[PDB]
Amino acid sequence: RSDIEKLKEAIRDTNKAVQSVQSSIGNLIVAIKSVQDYVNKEIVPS
């Protein structure tokens, strides 16, 4: 219940929040890349 120990646990939780945000970003890159792959191979030759 120490003040300093309570502060560390909040930063550790905040870091895990950031890590999942980073995973989300990586998947947004895959999503957008899927759009570029879909028009460069399916729409442009059509």
């Binding site: 502060l7 909040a10 939780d13 950031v18 899927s34």
Partner: protein, 34 residues
Amino acid sequence: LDPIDXSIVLNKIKSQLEESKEWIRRSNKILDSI
């Protein structure tokens, strides 16, 4: 032409985004005690 699809990918971002919100909920929960 076949319709475009990454529903699996977008659903994974929704799921990951909910985990991020829960971590913030844990953090703000501890700060309220200080």
